[PDB]
Every structure is written in C-alpha cells, then in structure tokens.
C-alpha cells in the first residue's frame, strides 16, 4: 500500500494531551480570601481638606489597600457602608498608601454616612 502526501512539508501529528489527575492536591487548604472587603477599604482619611470634600463633594475619602483596584474598592465600599458609589478616583499618597475618592450617588448624603461611621 501507500498514502497520498498532498504536501511535502511534514508536521507533528496531534496527540491526546491528557488532563491532570493530581493524587495529592498541592496546598493543604485553599487560602482564605486575602484582600477581602475588610482589607480593601483600610481606614478613613479625616484631614480638614478631605473633610471639606465630604460635606460638599459628596465623596468619602478612604485609605485603601495598595493591592485594591477601583473595582474591589467600589464593591467593598458598597458592601461595608451600604451605599451607591457613583465614581472612584484613586491616587497613591507620597507615603506609599493609596487614597480613594469615592463619590456617593444623589440618593445618599455623604456627611450623614460619614458620622454614621462616626467621624465629623
């Protein structure tokens, strides 16, 4: 017998590539959720300036995990303080800590919820 080679360029035949059946895990237990909502938003920023932004801009200024992006912030800001977050602007302070400018939607008062967390 023979076979019809339509091309003279040989190529590597395809092969099953079995999936993985470990037999002993890797880790003992999965890591608990690092960077959870009680991590993400770290602490309020109470400076007289950021304060003036609370009672006017309807923005809550928070120190945040340096590891927490704008999504994690907004999710954890909603979850913890039970409010609608319009937009989020984050810088990193000179000292190497992230500051988040979190604006509350029209449905809420940022000064209320501010000293509902008990700073005013």
């Amino acid at each position: 017998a023979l076979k019809v080679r339509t091309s003279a360029t040989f190529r590597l035949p395809k092969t099953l590539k079995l999936a993985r059946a470990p037999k002993y895990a890797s880790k003992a237990v999965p890591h608990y959720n690092r960077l959870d909502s009680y991590k993400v938003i770290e602490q309020p920023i109470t400076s007289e300036t950021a304060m003036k932004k609370v009672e006017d801009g309807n923005i809550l200024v928070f120190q945040v995990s340096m590891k927490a992006n704008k999504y994690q912030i907004k999710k954890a800001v909603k979850e913890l303080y039970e409010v609608d977050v319009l937009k989020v602007n984050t810088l990193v302070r000179p000292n190497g800590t992230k500051k988040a400018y979190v604006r509350l939607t029209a449905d809420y008062d940022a000064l209320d919820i501010a000293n509902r967390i008990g700073y005013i």
Partner: peptide, 11 residues
C-alpha cells in the same frame, strides 16, 4: 495536488 510522498522532507 499530486502525491509528493517521495519528495517529502522527512523527520
């Protein structure tokens, strides 16, 4: 197309 089976560059 033709049978190049003789011409193939083989492994």
């Amino acid at each position: 197309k033709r049978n190049l089976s003789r011409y193939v560059k083989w492994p």
